[PDB]
């Protein structure tokens, strides 16, 4: 901003540019997010007394959480991947991110947590 009348500007914005990642793509935000589930998700184990019940009755630890939730990770993935949008936005985030734990709560679940 140094000329209003006279411009003769044959090159401009040169450095004036950058694009930034201001949310995740679907791909990006599950890669980021997928191996932050098992930390989560067998907390949700832990927090609830009501579900620390089944918990301890198989006798069952965070890291043997941990090494098996990877597996509902990349199944819940390609469940929701189909139905989510081109970018995640952070709301977006919260939305299907919720909706990988309830399936991971119950993939792990029904394997491990059910002796059946």
Same mark, same amino acid.
């Given at each position: 901003?140094?000329?209003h009348?006279?411009?003769?500007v044959?090159?401009?914005?040169?450095?004036?540019d950058?694009?930034?990642?201001?949310?995740?793509?679907?791909?990006?935000?599950?890669?980021?997010?997928? +191996?932050?589930?098992?930390?989560?998700?067998?907390?949700?184990?832990?927090?609830?007394?009501?579900?620390?019940?089944?918990?301890?009755?198989?006798?069952?630890?965070?890291?043997?959480?941990?090494?098996?939730?990877?597996?509902?990770?990349? !199944?819940?993935?390609?469940?929701l991947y189909?139905s989510?949008?081109d970018?995640?936005?952070?709301?977006?985030?919260?939305?299907?991110?919720?909706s990988?734990?309830?399936?991971?709560?119950?993939?792990?679940?029904?394997?491990?947590?059910? +002796? !059946?």
């Amino acid at each position: 901003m140094a000329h209003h009348h006279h411009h003769h500007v044959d090159d401009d914005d040169k450095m004036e540019d950058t694009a930034n990642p201001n949310e995740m793509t679907k791909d990006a935000w599950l890669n980021s997010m997928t +191996p932050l589930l098992p930390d989560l998700i067998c907390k949700g184990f832990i927090q609830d007394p009501d579900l620390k019940k089944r918990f301890d009755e198989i006798k069952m630890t965070y890291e043997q959480c941990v090494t098996l939730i990877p597996e509902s990770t990349k !199944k819940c993935q390609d469940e929701l991947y189909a139905s989510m949008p081109d970018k995640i936005n952070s709301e977006t985030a919260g939305t299907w991110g919720r909706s990988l734990g309830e399936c991971i709560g119950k993939d792990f679940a029904e394997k491990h947590l059910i +002796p !059946k």
